[PDB]
Amino acid sequence: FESKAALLAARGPEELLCFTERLEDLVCFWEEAPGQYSFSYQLEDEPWKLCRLHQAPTARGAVRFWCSLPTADTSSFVPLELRVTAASGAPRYHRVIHINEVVLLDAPVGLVARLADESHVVLRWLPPPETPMTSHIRYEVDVSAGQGAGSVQRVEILEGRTECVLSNLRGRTRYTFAVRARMAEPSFGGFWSAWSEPVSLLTPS
Amino acid sequence: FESKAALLAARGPEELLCFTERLEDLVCFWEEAPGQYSFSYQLEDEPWKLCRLHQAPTAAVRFWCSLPTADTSSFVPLELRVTAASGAPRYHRVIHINEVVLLDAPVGLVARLADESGHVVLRWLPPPETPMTSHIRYEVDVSAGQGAGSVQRVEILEGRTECVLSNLRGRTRYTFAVRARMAEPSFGGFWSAWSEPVSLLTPSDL
Amino acid sequence: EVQLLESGGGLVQPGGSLRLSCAASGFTFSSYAMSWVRQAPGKGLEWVSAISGSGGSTYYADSVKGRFTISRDNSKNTLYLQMNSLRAEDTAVYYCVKDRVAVAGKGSYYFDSWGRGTTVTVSS
Amino acid sequence: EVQLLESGGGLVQPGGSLRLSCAASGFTFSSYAMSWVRQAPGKGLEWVSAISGSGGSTYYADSVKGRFTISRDNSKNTLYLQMNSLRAEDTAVYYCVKDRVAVAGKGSYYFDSWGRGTTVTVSS
Amino acid sequence: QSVLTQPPSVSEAPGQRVTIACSGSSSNIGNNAVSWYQQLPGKAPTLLIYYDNLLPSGVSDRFSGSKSGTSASLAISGLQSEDEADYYCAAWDDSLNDWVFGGGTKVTVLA
Amino acid sequence: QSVLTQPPSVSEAPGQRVTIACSGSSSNIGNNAVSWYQQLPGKAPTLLIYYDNLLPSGVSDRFSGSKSGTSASLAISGLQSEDEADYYCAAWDDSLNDWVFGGGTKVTVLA
Numbered sequence: 001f002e003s004k005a006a007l008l009a010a011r012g013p014e015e016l017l018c019f020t021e022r023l024e025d026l027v028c029f030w031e032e033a034p035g036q037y038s039f040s041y042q043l044e045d046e047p048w049k050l051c052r053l054h055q056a057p058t059a060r061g062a063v064r065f066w067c068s069l070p071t072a073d074t075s076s077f078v079p080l081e082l083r084v085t086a087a088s089g090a091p092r093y094h095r096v097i098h099i100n101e102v103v104l105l106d107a108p109v110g111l112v113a114r115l116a117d118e119s120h121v122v123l124r125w126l127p128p129p130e131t132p133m134t135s136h137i138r139y140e141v142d143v144s145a146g147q148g149a150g151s152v153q154r155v156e157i158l159e160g161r162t163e164c165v166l167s168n169l170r171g172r173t174r175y176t177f178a179v180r181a182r183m184a185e186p187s188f189g190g191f192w193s194a195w196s197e198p199v200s201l202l203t204p205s
Numbered sequence: 206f207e208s209k210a211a212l213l214a215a216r217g218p219e220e221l222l223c224f225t226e227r228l229e230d231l232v233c234f235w236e237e238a239p240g241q242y243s244f245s246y247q248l249e250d251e252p253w254k255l256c257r258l259h260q261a262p263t264a265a266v267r268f269w270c271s272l273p274t275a276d277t278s279s280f281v282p283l284e285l286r287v288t289a290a291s292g293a294p295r296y297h298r299v300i301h302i303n304e305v306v307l308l309d310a311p312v313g314l315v316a317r318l319a320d321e322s323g324h325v326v327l328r329w330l331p332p333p334e335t336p337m338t339s340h341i342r343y344e345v346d347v348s349a350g351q352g353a354g355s356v357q358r359v360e361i362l363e364g365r366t367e368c369v370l371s372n373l374r375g376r377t378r379y380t381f382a383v384r385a386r387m388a389e390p391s392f393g394g395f396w397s398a399w400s401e402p403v404s405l406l407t408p409s410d411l
Numbered sequence: 412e413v414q415l416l417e418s419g420g421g422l423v424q425p426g427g428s429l430r431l432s433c434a435a436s437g438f439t440f441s442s443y444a445m446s447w448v449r450q451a452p453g454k455g456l457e458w459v460s461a462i463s464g465s466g467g468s469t470y471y472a473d474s475v476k477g478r479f480t481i482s483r484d485n486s487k488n489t490l491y492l493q494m495n496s497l498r499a500e501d502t503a504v505y506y507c508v509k510d511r512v513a514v515a516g517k518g519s520y521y522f523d524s525w526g527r528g529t530t531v532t533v534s535s
Numbered sequence: 536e537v538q539l540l541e542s543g544g545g546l547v548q549p550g551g552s553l554r555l556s557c558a559a560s561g562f563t564f565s566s567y568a569m570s571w572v573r574q575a576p577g578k579g580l581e582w583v584s585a586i587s588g589s590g591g592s593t594y595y596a597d598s599v600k601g602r603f604t605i606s607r608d609n610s611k612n613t614l615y616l617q618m619n620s621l622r623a624e625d626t627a628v629y630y631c632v633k634d635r636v637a638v639a640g641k642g643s644y645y646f647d648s649w650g651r652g653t654t655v656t657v658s659s
Numbered sequence: 660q661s662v663l664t665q666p667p668s669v670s671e672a673p674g675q676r677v678t679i680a681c682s683g684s685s686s687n688i689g690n691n692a693v694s695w696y697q698q699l700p701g702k703a704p705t706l707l708i709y710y711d712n713l714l715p716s717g718v719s720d721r722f723s724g725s726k727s728g729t730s731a732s733l734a735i736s737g738l739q740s741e742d743e744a745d746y747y748c749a750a751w752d753d754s755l756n757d758w759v760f761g762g763g764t765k766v767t768v769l770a
Numbered sequence: 771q772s773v774l775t776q777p778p779s780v781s782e783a784p785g786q787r788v789t790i791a792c793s794g795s796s797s798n799i800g801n802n803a804v805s806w807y808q809q810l811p812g813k814a815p816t817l818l819i820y821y822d823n824l825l826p827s828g829v830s831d832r833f834s835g836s837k838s839g840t841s842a843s844l845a846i847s848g849l850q851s852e853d854e855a856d857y858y859c860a861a862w863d864d865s866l867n868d869w870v871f872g873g874g875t876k877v878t879v880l881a
Contacts, residue, residue, distance in 0.1 A: 579761060580747055649696075
């Protein structure tokens with residue numbers, strides 16, 4: 001999960017970052033530049049438990065501590081109080097999160113483009129492999145034309161929909177499409193997934 | 206306009222960044238760490254022209270071209286070219302002004318307790334004196350305290366300026382914020398800065 | 412691999428009492444929550460009661476409030492259901508259901524494993 | 536500030552010819568594009584023709600192609616409209632309209648300045 | 660006829676409010692910038708409203724423009740006798756490749 | 771009565787396709803995860819479909835689940851005699867605050 005960790009580590013310098021992938025798991029981590037820490041949590045009103053704290057070095061000369069929360073405690077829609085404390089008893093982090101509000105899906109797959117028909121491109125893709133409740137996933141399609149233009153269009157795709165019909169595209173231009181995914185409002189939330197494997201296309205006329 | 210520049214300069218380390226604010230202007234800039242440069246452009250099929258290149262230091266030096274108003278035509282290819290004094294090329298882009306819009310932040314954010322318990326009604330105003338408000342789509346951010354952070358992001362369709370939020374926990378202090386951008390397919394650009402946030406505290410559930 | 416064995420069910424009359432038991436094995440009992448689900452003919456399945464892993468949190472259906480009492484013994488890996496002041500409408504097959512997480516509720520998404528089920532008959 | 540003075544045109548017969556002129560002042564003429572918009576009763580406004588700043592690009596309505604010819608003299612700040620083979624339906628008030636940008640089209644968003652307008656009458 | 664449709668004539672008492680409709684299609688008003696022009700009798704058309712809703716510098720506060728779907732509207736609040744003129748709506752068309760205008764609306768002010 | 775509505779009985783020839791509806795509201799099926807359960811006669815209920823459309827490890831490829839608005843459906847293609855059982859749909863309800871189920875659907879296979 002190094003890709004998602006580093007991707008999320010961009011939005012946060014030194015904060016406790018948590019995310020779930022398929023709603024039956026949870027990973028909380030942070031990075032420092034050593035020291036020893038203990039990870040304690042409380043699912044709803046259940047008694048406090050401890051999480052086995054892993055540690056490994058990351059590039060740029062820094063150590064990363066992460067807790068892989070036990071599957072048995074991956075309950076959504078309930079307050080999960082987290083607390084990282086130092087060996088000296090001094091507090092380090094403190095969050096009250098909901099597992100369903102920190103989703104970081106994988107990148108969408110199966111991107112295909114078609115020229116049909118009226119001078120318009122039909123985009124179709126598939127939701128990330130083995131991902132729960134595909135009908136609650138909304139997407140965002142990025143259109144880049146190149147030649148220094150960059151992103152020229154970004155269309156927001158409604159939840160559940162996996163096809164997009166693009167209009168008003170300039171001819172004799174080589175476009176490149178990409179799709180990203182995330183869980184939809186209001187019963188979910190999280191972060192934008194990585195961009196899908198891009199697909200290029202050359203327009204006629 | 207340094208605020209919008211720096212906002213855009215975050216998404217791009219060392220590239221030629223162009224943006225329009227009210228579709229009757231265009232600013233292209235880049236940053237370096239000194240040099241002399243010339244800015245040339247060609248609007249559609251018209252003859253090539255030159256742009257007066259300004260420069261100022263940033264916390265290192267930033268060169269920007271404020272394109273003449275008379276050549277700020279949208280929906281047509283605008284070829285750009287940054288060349289050094291030695292004749293050596295530096296940048297080259299073919300952009301469309303209508304595809305690089307950077308609006309101001311929305312204003313007049315207000316939150317109200319709706320009828321259905323657990324619902325909050327958001328109302329805001331489009332950026333002051335912004336062309337074609339019905340072609341502006343928005344994005345609402347819902348942030349909770351106690352370390353939760355962003356818990357919801359609702360995408361608002363173009364033209365609509367109100368949002369009805371659902372599934373909010375009681376006895377919680379939420380904080381809302383809205384940002385704006387021009388809509389597809391006849392436009393494009395970048396997300397505006399977040400509006401001045403507005404908080405609201407929900408009561409208990411009966 | 413999960414096995415759930417119900418017991419303590421049979422025939423009683425209105426006002427009677429029974430004590431159901433669920434012998435759980437094949438998994439760590441104290442880490443998951445448990446539920447009781449009954450099926451009367453024409454009423455389908457109903458979520459009767461549920462208890463969390465530590466037993467701190469309990470839920471009861473509105474039709475069994477005050478009459479039923481759910482509990483668990485983590486040392487013995489057994490789930491109990493104390494049925495008092497029984498009514499005719501309590502007549503159903505009571506299933507022992509293991510939850511996915513440590514607390515039964517919305518965040519469970521689904522019921523993973525069911526048991527064979529014991530029958531509770533209430534008549535005159 | 537901006538001033539546009541139309542001239543030429545009057546009363547002619549079908550098959551006649553005219554040459555309209557627009558005396559522009561108050562702005563840099565060679566930096567902006569120009570257009571001809573006519574106003575017939577019951578036909579409203581119509582985009583007759585338009586020419587770019589440098590004069591390289593020109594547009595004509597489908598109803599005046601081959602009969603009309605638009606041109607400009609940047610040294611004299613003047614817009615011309617050569618009207619040949621006039622018909623009865625060409626009878627309208629021809630306005631000299633200054634565009635917002637260097638090329639008239641969709642990206643102009645609106646017409647900037649209009650002139651007093653000269654009248655072209657075609658009858659027997 | 661015209662591609663854009665305006666009511667030919669509109670009459671209203673002084674001080675009141677006047678609404679001038681301008682219906683089009685998905686090719687005109689639907690996805691393009693609407694502009695309004697005022698033409699006082701015997702004078703040159705002036706820019707009245709641009710960018711759907713924006714107001715040009717020098718135009719009275721009593722004028723305002725709006726847009727919903729494939730129809731734009733011009734509002735004249737606090738109607739005065741000086742406002743008695745002809746009002747045209749204009750927008751670019753994408754199906755056709757040129758500017759289209761409305762028939763025009765002659766606002767008449769009573770006494 | 772049940773909160774979720776299923777057809778009580780459905781009969782179909784072997785090898786064909788069977789569609790079992792499970793209609794609810796905006797509070798149950800509308801915005802919550804739907805689950806399906808198979809109960810073979812005289813046996814314990816098994817998890818058939820979870821997460822609206824996903825399939826548990828060990829379930830036949832012939833079973834599939836879908837969801838549109840306030841209604842979910844179970845599809846049984848290549849109908850066999852082994853599939854002759856009772857099928858329940860379940861989802862959390864938000865208007866209420868407990869799990870709700872359907873009346874159940876008895877799939878009968880002819881000869």
